[PDB]
Protein backbone atom coordinates (compact mmCIF):
# COMPACT_ATOMS: atom_id res chain seq x y z
CA UNK A 1 0.00 0.00 0.00
CA UNK A 2 0.96 3.70 -0.32
CA UNK A 3 0.39 4.13 3.40
CA UNK A 4 3.09 1.48 3.73
CA UNK A 5 5.58 3.58 1.72
CA UNK A 6 4.72 6.75 3.65
CA UNK A 7 4.92 4.96 7.00
CA UNK A 8 8.28 3.61 6.04
CA UNK A 9 9.67 7.05 5.00
CA UNK A 10 8.42 8.58 8.24
CA UNK A 11 9.91 5.91 10.48
CA UNK A 12 13.11 6.32 8.49
CA UNK A 13 13.16 10.00 9.18
CA UNK A 14 12.18 9.90 12.84
CA UNK A 15 14.90 7.33 13.22
CA UNK A 16 17.40 9.72 11.65
CA UNK A 17 16.27 12.26 14.27
CA UNK A 18 16.87 9.84 17.05
CA UNK A 19 20.30 9.10 15.81
CA UNK A 20 20.89 12.74 15.99
CA UNK A 21 19.79 12.56 19.60
CA UNK A 22 22.09 9.71 20.53
CA UNK A 23 24.75 11.65 18.62
CA UNK A 24 24.53 14.13 21.44
CA UNK A 25 24.75 10.97 23.54
CA UNK A 26 21.61 12.11 25.32
CA UNK A 27 20.13 8.68 24.87
CA UNK A 28 20.12 6.23 27.74
CA UNK A 29 20.87 2.56 26.97
CA UNK A 30 17.42 0.98 26.31
CA UNK A 31 16.87 3.84 23.88
CA UNK A 32 20.10 3.09 22.06
CA UNK A 33 18.88 -0.52 21.85
CA UNK A 34 15.67 0.72 20.22
CA UNK A 35 17.99 2.60 17.86
CA UNK A 36 20.05 -0.44 16.81
CA UNK A 37 17.07 -2.86 16.64
CA UNK A 38 14.97 -0.35 14.68
CA UNK A 39 17.84 0.24 12.29
CA UNK A 40 17.91 -3.49 11.54
CA UNK A 41 14.13 -3.75 11.25
CA UNK A 42 14.45 -0.77 8.88
CA UNK A 43 17.15 -2.26 6.64
CA UNK A 44 15.02 -5.39 6.36
CA UNK A 45 11.83 -3.43 5.72
CA UNK A 46 13.35 -1.29 2.95
CA UNK A 47 15.15 -4.17 1.41
CA UNK A 48 11.77 -5.94 0.99
CA UNK A 49 9.59 -3.16 -0.54
CA UNK A 50 12.73 -2.20 -2.34
CA UNK A 51 13.30 1.42 -1.49
CA UNK A 52 16.76 2.55 -0.48
CA UNK A 53 16.88 4.46 2.75
CA UNK A 54 18.60 7.73 1.91
CA UNK A 55 15.66 8.93 -0.16
CA UNK A 56 13.03 7.27 2.03
CA UNK A 57 14.47 9.46 4.79
CA UNK A 58 14.29 12.70 2.81
CA UNK A 59 10.68 11.82 1.98
CA UNK A 60 9.99 11.23 5.69
CA UNK A 61 11.63 14.55 6.39
CA UNK A 62 9.16 16.26 4.07
CA UNK A 63 6.10 14.42 5.48
CA UNK A 64 7.08 15.18 9.02
CA UNK A 65 8.00 18.78 8.19
CA UNK A 66 4.42 18.97 6.96
CA UNK A 67 3.10 17.55 10.26
CA UNK A 68 5.16 19.95 12.36
CA UNK A 69 3.70 22.55 10.16
CA UNK A 70 0.17 21.88 11.18
CA UNK A 71 -1.00 21.94 14.79
CA UNK A 72 -2.07 24.23 16.34
CA UNK A 73 -1.77 23.06 19.89
CA UNK A 74 -0.66 26.34 21.18
CA UNK A 75 2.94 25.73 21.21
CA UNK A 76 3.79 22.35 20.16
CA UNK A 77 4.27 24.63 17.18
CA UNK A 78 7.95 24.95 16.27
CA UNK A 79 9.79 27.69 14.47
CA UNK A 80 12.74 26.68 12.34
CA UNK A 81 14.78 28.55 9.85
CA UNK A 82 18.36 27.28 9.73
CA UNK A 83 18.08 29.12 6.45
CA UNK A 84 20.74 31.15 4.70
CA UNK A 85 17.70 32.51 2.84
CA UNK A 86 18.49 32.36 -0.80
CA UNK A 87 19.43 34.14 -4.03
CA UNK A 88 17.51 33.74 -7.30
CA UNK A 89 18.95 33.36 -10.79
CA UNK A 90 17.05 33.93 -14.00
CA UNK A 91 18.46 33.10 -17.41
CA UNK A 92 15.04 33.36 -18.89
CA UNK A 93 13.02 36.38 -19.72
CA UNK A 94 9.46 35.49 -18.85
CA UNK A 95 8.80 36.06 -22.55
CA UNK A 96 10.82 32.86 -23.07
CA UNK A 97 9.69 31.09 -19.86
CA UNK A 98 6.17 31.30 -21.23
CA UNK A 99 6.33 30.38 -24.88
CA UNK A 100 4.41 27.90 -26.99
CA UNK A 101 6.13 24.66 -27.96
CA UNK A 102 5.68 21.00 -28.69
CA UNK A 103 7.55 17.89 -29.68
CA UNK A 104 7.41 16.27 -33.09
CA UNK A 105 8.96 13.14 -31.64
CA UNK A 106 8.20 13.57 -27.94
CA UNK A 107 10.37 11.92 -25.33
CA UNK A 108 9.40 12.10 -21.64
CA UNK A 109 11.35 10.75 -18.71
CA UNK A 110 10.92 11.17 -14.98
CA UNK A 111 13.83 11.00 -12.57
CA UNK A 112 14.37 12.37 -9.09
CA UNK A 113 11.04 14.19 -9.04
CA UNK A 114 11.78 16.05 -12.29
CA UNK A 115 10.13 15.68 -15.69
CA UNK A 116 12.56 15.72 -18.56
CA UNK A 117 11.06 16.45 -21.95
CA UNK A 118 12.90 16.38 -25.24
CA UNK A 119 12.21 16.57 -28.97
CA UNK A 120 13.63 13.46 -30.60
CA UNK A 121 13.90 14.93 -34.08
CA UNK A 122 16.20 17.81 -33.57
CA UNK A 123 19.44 17.30 -35.38
CA UNK A 124 22.72 19.10 -35.95
CA UNK A 125 21.67 22.22 -34.00
CA UNK A 126 23.41 24.30 -31.38
CA UNK A 127 21.49 24.56 -28.15
CA UNK A 128 21.95 26.24 -24.84
CA UNK A 129 20.20 25.25 -21.67
CA UNK A 130 18.84 28.25 -19.82
CA UNK A 131 17.60 27.76 -16.26
CA UNK A 132 15.81 29.87 -13.68
CA UNK A 133 16.65 28.45 -10.29
CA UNK A 134 17.77 29.24 -6.79
CA UNK A 135 21.14 29.23 -5.02
CA UNK A 136 22.38 28.81 -1.49
CA UNK A 137 26.14 29.26 -1.43
CA UNK A 138 27.53 28.20 -4.82
CA UNK A 139 25.54 24.96 -4.69
CA UNK A 140 21.98 24.74 -5.97
CA UNK A 141 19.05 23.85 -3.78
CA UNK A 142 16.29 23.95 -6.25
CA UNK A 143 15.13 24.54 -9.84
CA UNK A 144 12.19 26.61 -11.09
CA UNK A 145 12.33 25.94 -14.85
CA UNK A 146 14.92 24.69 -17.26
CA UNK A 147 14.45 25.03 -21.03
CA UNK A 148 16.73 24.13 -23.97
CA UNK A 149 17.07 26.69 -26.78
CA UNK A 150 18.33 26.46 -30.36
CA UNK A 151 20.34 29.01 -32.35
CA UNK A 152 17.07 30.62 -33.40
CA UNK A 153 15.53 30.74 -29.92
CA UNK A 154 13.26 27.69 -29.71
CA UNK A 155 12.27 25.07 -27.16
CA UNK A 156 13.58 21.67 -27.99
CA UNK A 157 13.72 20.51 -24.35
CA UNK A 158 12.57 21.13 -20.76
CA UNK A 159 13.33 20.03 -17.21
CA UNK A 160 10.56 20.92 -14.78
CA UNK A 161 10.17 19.95 -11.11
CA UNK A 162 7.41 17.69 -9.68
CA UNK A 163 5.27 17.71 -6.49
CA UNK A 164 6.31 14.21 -5.46
CA UNK A 165 8.14 12.59 -2.54
CA UNK A 166 10.89 13.39 -2.01
CA UNK A 167 11.39 16.62 -3.85
CA UNK A 168 14.34 17.19 -6.05
CA UNK A 169 17.86 18.07 -5.04
CA UNK A 170 20.83 19.74 -6.69
CA UNK A 171 21.94 16.19 -7.51
CA UNK A 172 18.64 15.14 -9.08
CA UNK A 173 19.00 18.23 -11.20
CA UNK A 174 22.59 17.53 -12.12
CA UNK A 175 21.77 14.08 -13.43
CA UNK A 176 18.73 15.50 -14.98
CA UNK A 177 20.83 17.89 -17.00
CA UNK A 178 23.18 15.06 -17.85
CA UNK A 179 20.28 13.02 -19.27
CA UNK A 180 18.76 15.91 -21.24
CA UNK A 181 22.12 16.81 -22.77
CA UNK A 182 23.30 13.35 -23.44
CA UNK A 183 20.19 12.44 -25.28
CA UNK A 184 20.23 15.64 -27.20
CA UNK A 185 23.78 14.98 -28.29
CA UNK A 186 22.87 11.40 -29.31
CA UNK A 187 21.04 12.73 -32.40
CA UNK A 188 23.66 15.13 -33.35
CA UNK A 189 23.54 18.39 -31.52
CA UNK A 190 25.78 20.54 -29.40
CA UNK A 191 24.68 21.58 -25.98
CA UNK A 192 26.24 24.56 -24.25
CA UNK A 193 24.81 25.23 -20.81
CA UNK A 194 24.43 28.81 -19.49
CA UNK A 195 27.25 30.32 -17.36
CA UNK A 196 25.01 30.56 -14.29
CA UNK A 197 24.45 26.83 -14.56
CA UNK A 198 28.09 26.20 -15.40
CA UNK A 199 28.93 28.39 -12.40
CA UNK A 200 26.51 26.47 -10.16
CA UNK A 201 25.39 23.28 -11.73
CA UNK A 202 28.29 21.02 -11.85
CA UNK B 1 19.76 9.63 34.83
CA UNK B 2 19.12 12.95 33.02
CA UNK B 3 19.64 11.20 29.70
CA UNK B 4 16.72 9.05 30.83
CA UNK B 5 14.46 12.11 31.27
CA UNK B 6 15.54 13.60 27.93
CA UNK B 7 15.10 10.28 26.13
CA UNK B 8 11.67 9.97 27.59
CA UNK B 9 10.60 13.52 26.52
CA UNK B 10 11.89 12.89 23.00
CA UNK B 11 10.12 9.56 22.58
CA UNK B 12 7.02 11.27 23.93
CA UNK B 13 7.26 13.95 21.31
CA UNK B 14 8.13 11.75 18.35
CA UNK B 15 5.20 9.64 19.39
CA UNK B 16 2.95 12.70 19.31
CA UNK B 17 4.22 13.26 15.74
CA UNK B 18 3.35 9.77 14.76
CA UNK B 19 -0.10 10.13 16.11
CA UNK B 20 -0.38 13.09 13.94
CA UNK B 21 0.60 10.86 11.06
CA UNK B 22 -1.95 8.17 11.80
CA UNK B 23 -4.38 11.06 12.25
CA UNK B 24 -4.03 11.54 8.53
CA UNK B 25 -4.57 7.77 8.53
CA UNK B 26 -1.39 7.47 6.50
CA UNK B 27 -0.19 4.75 8.81
CA UNK B 28 -0.46 1.13 7.78
CA UNK B 29 -1.50 -1.42 10.43
CA UNK B 30 1.82 -2.65 11.94
CA UNK B 31 2.68 1.02 12.39
CA UNK B 32 -0.56 1.68 14.24
CA UNK B 33 0.35 -1.30 16.44
CA UNK B 34 3.70 0.35 17.20
CA UNK B 35 1.61 3.41 18.06
CA UNK B 36 -0.68 1.65 20.57
CA UNK B 37 2.10 -0.51 22.12
CA UNK B 38 4.44 2.47 22.42
CA UNK B 39 1.69 4.53 24.01
CA UNK B 40 1.33 1.86 26.69
CA UNK B 41 5.08 1.49 27.18
CA UNK B 42 5.07 5.29 27.50
CA UNK B 43 2.32 5.53 30.11
CA UNK B 44 4.18 2.91 32.13
CA UNK B 45 7.54 4.62 31.66
CA UNK B 46 6.28 8.05 32.74
CA UNK B 47 4.28 6.67 35.58
CA UNK B 48 7.51 5.15 36.99
CA UNK B 49 9.96 8.11 36.78
CA UNK B 50 6.96 10.17 37.67
CA UNK B 51 6.67 12.75 34.95
CA UNK B 52 3.29 13.42 33.39
CA UNK B 53 3.25 13.23 29.64
CA UNK B 54 1.84 16.54 28.48
CA UNK B 55 4.92 18.44 29.62
CA UNK B 56 7.34 15.63 28.78
CA UNK B 57 6.03 16.03 25.23
CA UNK B 58 6.53 19.80 25.10
CA UNK B 59 10.07 19.22 26.37
CA UNK B 60 10.61 16.62 23.63
CA UNK B 61 9.24 19.13 21.16
CA UNK B 62 11.91 21.62 22.20
CA UNK B 63 14.76 19.06 22.13
CA UNK B 64 13.76 17.81 18.74
CA UNK B 65 13.17 21.33 17.41
CA UNK B 66 16.78 21.87 18.42
CA UNK B 67 17.89 18.75 16.49
CA UNK B 68 15.99 19.76 13.37
CA UNK B 69 17.72 23.00 13.79
CA UNK B 70 21.15 21.59 13.40
CA UNK B 71 22.23 19.54 10.40
CA UNK B 72 23.45 20.49 7.87
CA UNK B 73 22.96 17.58 5.56
CA UNK B 74 22.10 19.68 2.64
CA UNK B 75 18.46 19.46 2.85
CA UNK B 76 17.35 17.31 5.58
CA UNK B 77 17.14 20.89 6.79
CA UNK B 78 13.53 21.97 7.28
CA UNK B 79 11.98 25.39 7.21
CA UNK B 80 9.01 25.98 9.46
CA UNK B 81 7.19 29.08 10.45
CA UNK B 82 3.52 28.39 11.17
CA UNK B 83 4.04 31.71 12.88
CA UNK B 84 1.61 34.58 13.15
CA UNK B 85 4.80 36.49 14.02
CA UNK B 86 4.09 38.44 17.11
CA UNK B 87 3.39 41.78 18.79
CA UNK B 88 5.35 43.10 21.78
CA UNK B 89 3.97 44.84 24.87
CA UNK B 90 5.99 46.93 27.27
CA UNK B 91 4.61 48.25 30.53
CA UNK B 92 8.07 48.99 31.71
CA UNK B 93 10.36 51.79 30.78
CA UNK B 94 13.81 50.27 30.64
CA UNK B 95 14.61 52.73 33.42
CA UNK B 96 12.34 50.53 35.57
CA UNK B 97 13.23 47.20 33.91
CA UNK B 98 16.79 47.84 35.03
CA UNK B 99 16.66 49.10 38.57
CA UNK B 100 18.40 48.05 41.75
CA UNK B 101 16.44 46.05 44.31
CA UNK B 102 16.60 43.38 46.95
CA UNK B 103 14.51 41.51 49.45
CA UNK B 104 14.60 42.04 53.18
CA UNK B 105 12.75 38.78 53.67
CA UNK B 106 13.45 37.02 50.37
CA UNK B 107 11.09 34.40 49.06
CA UNK B 108 11.97 32.42 45.91
CA UNK B 109 9.84 29.85 44.17
CA UNK B 110 10.20 28.09 40.84
CA UNK B 111 7.24 26.87 38.85
CA UNK B 112 6.72 26.12 35.19
CA UNK B 113 10.19 27.32 34.22
CA UNK B 114 9.70 30.72 35.88
CA UNK B 115 11.39 32.16 38.96
CA UNK B 116 9.05 33.98 41.26
CA UNK B 117 10.69 36.34 43.72
CA UNK B 118 8.94 38.25 46.45
CA UNK B 119 9.73 40.42 49.47
CA UNK B 120 8.10 38.86 52.51
CA UNK B 121 8.05 42.03 54.59
CA UNK B 122 5.98 44.33 52.50
CA UNK B 123 2.75 45.18 54.22
CA UNK B 124 -0.34 47.26 53.61
CA UNK B 125 0.92 48.68 50.29
CA UNK B 126 -0.71 49.10 46.91
CA UNK B 127 1.15 47.37 44.12
CA UNK B 128 0.74 46.96 40.43
CA UNK B 129 2.32 44.24 38.38
CA UNK B 130 3.88 45.59 35.21
CA UNK B 131 4.98 43.11 32.56
CA UNK B 132 6.88 43.29 29.29
CA UNK B 133 5.84 40.30 27.23
CA UNK B 134 4.70 39.11 23.85
CA UNK B 135 1.30 38.41 22.29
CA UNK B 136 -0.07 36.21 19.55
CA UNK B 137 -3.78 36.87 19.17
CA UNK B 138 -5.16 37.98 22.54
CA UNK B 139 -3.46 35.06 24.27
CA UNK B 140 0.11 35.28 25.55
CA UNK B 141 2.89 33.09 24.29
CA UNK B 142 5.71 34.31 26.36
CA UNK B 143 7.01 36.68 29.06
CA UNK B 144 10.14 38.85 29.03
CA UNK B 145 10.04 40.38 32.52
CA UNK B 146 7.42 40.90 35.16
CA UNK B 147 8.01 43.23 38.12
CA UNK B 148 5.74 44.30 41.01
CA UNK B 149 5.69 48.00 41.92
CA UNK B 150 4.51 49.90 45.00
CA UNK B 151 2.77 53.28 45.19
CA UNK B 152 6.19 54.92 45.26
CA UNK B 153 7.65 52.96 42.34
CA UNK B 154 9.64 50.13 43.91
CA UNK B 155 10.34 46.46 43.26
CA UNK B 156 8.77 44.21 45.79
CA UNK B 157 8.44 41.25 43.40
CA UNK B 158 9.55 39.69 40.10
CA UNK B 159 8.62 36.87 37.74
CA UNK B 160 11.38 36.04 35.29
CA UNK B 161 11.60 33.16 32.78
CA UNK B 162 14.12 30.27 32.91
CA UNK B 163 16.17 28.34 30.30
CA UNK B 164 14.81 24.96 31.35
CA UNK B 165 12.78 22.15 29.77
CA UNK B 166 10.09 22.75 28.82
CA UNK B 167 9.92 26.49 28.55
CA UNK B 168 7.08 28.43 29.99
CA UNK B 169 3.62 28.89 28.57
CA UNK B 170 0.85 31.44 28.95
CA UNK B 171 -0.53 29.05 31.56
CA UNK B 172 2.70 28.77 33.53
CA UNK B 173 2.66 32.53 33.58
CA UNK B 174 -0.96 32.76 34.64
CA UNK B 175 -0.39 30.56 37.66
CA UNK B 176 2.79 32.34 38.24
CA UNK B 177 0.95 35.61 38.55
CA UNK B 178 -1.60 33.94 40.76
CA UNK B 179 1.15 32.79 43.15
CA UNK B 180 2.96 36.15 43.23
CA UNK B 181 -0.28 38.02 43.91
CA UNK B 182 -1.72 35.62 46.36
CA UNK B 183 1.34 35.63 48.47
CA UNK B 184 1.62 39.34 48.30
CA UNK B 185 -1.94 39.70 49.49
CA UNK B 186 -1.31 37.22 52.34
CA UNK B 187 0.70 39.87 54.22
CA UNK B 188 -1.68 42.61 53.62
CA UNK B 189 -1.34 44.29 50.29
CA UNK B 190 -3.44 45.09 47.29
CA UNK B 191 -2.34 43.96 43.89
CA UNK B 192 -3.69 45.61 40.76
CA UNK B 193 -2.29 44.15 37.56
CA UNK B 194 -1.65 46.34 34.49
CA UNK B 195 -4.38 46.66 31.81
CA UNK B 196 -2.21 44.97 29.18
CA UNK B 197 -1.96 41.98 31.48
CA UNK B 198 -5.62 42.23 32.43
CA UNK B 199 -6.35 42.46 28.70
CA UNK B 200 -4.16 39.42 27.97
CA UNK B 201 -3.27 37.55 31.06
CA UNK B 202 -6.34 35.99 32.34
Swiss-Prot record, chains A, B:
Motif (Nuclear export signal): 136-145
Effect on the protein of changing residue 70 to G: Abolishes the formation of closed homodimers, open homodimers are still able to form
Motif Nuclear localization signal location, chain numbering: 33-37
Subcellular location(s) of the protein: Host nucleus; Host cytoplasm
Primary location group: host cell
Alphabetical keyword list: Eukaryotic host gene expression shutoff by virus, Host cytoplasm, Host gene expression shutoff by virus, Host mRNA suppression by virus, Host nucleus, Host-virus interaction, Inhibition of host innate immune response by virus, Inhibition of host interferon signaling pathway by virus, Inhibition of host PKR by virus, Inhibition of host pre-mRNA processing by virus, Inhibition of host RIG-I by virus, Inhibition of host RLR pathway by virus, Interferon antiviral system evasion, RNA-binding, Viral immunoevasion
GO CC terms of this entry: host cell cytoplasm; host cell nucleus
Outcome when changing residue 186 to Y: No effect on oligomerization
Gene Ontology biological-process entries: symbiont-mediated suppression of host cytoplasmic pattern recognition receptor signaling pathway via inhibition of RIG-I activity; symbiont-mediated suppression of host gene expression; symbiont-mediated suppression of host mRNA processing; symbiont-mediated suppression of host PKR/eIFalpha signaling; symbiont-mediated suppression of host type I interferon-mediated signaling pathway
Region ranges (RNA-binding and homodimerization): 1-72
Keyword Methyltransferase: no
CPSF4-binding as annotated region, ranges: 179-202
InterPro entries, A to Z: NS1, NS1A, NS1A_effect_dom-like_sf, uS15_NS1_RNA-bd_sf
One GO molecular-function entry: protein serine/threonine kinase inhibitor activity
Domain of life according to the entry: Viruses
Family to which the UniProt record says this protein belongs: Belongs to the influenza A viruses NS1 family.
HAMAP family in the record: INFV_NS1
Functional description taken from the UniProt entry: Inhibits post-transcriptional processing of cellular pre-mRNA, by binding and inhibiting two cellular proteins that are required for the 3'-end processing of cellular pre-mRNAs: the 30 kDa cleavage and polyadenylation specificity factor/CPSF4 and the poly(A)-binding protein 2/PABPN1. In turn, unprocessed 3' end pre-mRNAs accumulate in the host nucleus and are no longer exported to the cytoplasm. Cellular protein synthesis is thereby shut off very early after virus infection.
Entry's free-text remark on domains: The dsRNA-binding region is required for suppression of RNA silencing.
Subunit structure: Forms homodimers and higher-order oligomers. Interacts with host TRIM25 (via coiled coil); this interaction specifically inhibits TRIM25 multimerization and TRIM25-mediated RIGI CARD ubiquitination. Interacts with human EIF2AK2/PKR, CPSF4, IVNS1ABP and PABPN1. Interacts with human DLG1 (via PDZ domains 1 and 2) and human SCRIB; the interaction results in the translocation of DLG1 and SCRIB from the cell membrane to perinuclear puncta. Interacts indirectly with human LIN7C via its interaction with DLG1, the interaction facilitates translocation of LIN7C to cytoplasmic puncta.
Name this polypeptide is given: Non-structural protein 1
Lineage summary: Viruses, Riboviria, Orthornavirae, Negarnaviricota, Polyploviricotina
Amino acid sequence: DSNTVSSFQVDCFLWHVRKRFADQELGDAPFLDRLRADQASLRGRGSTLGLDIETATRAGKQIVERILEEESDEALKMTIASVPASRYLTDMTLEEMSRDWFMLMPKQKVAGSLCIRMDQAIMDKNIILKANFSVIFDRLETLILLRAFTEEGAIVGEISPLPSLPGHTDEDVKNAIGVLIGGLEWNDNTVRVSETLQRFAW
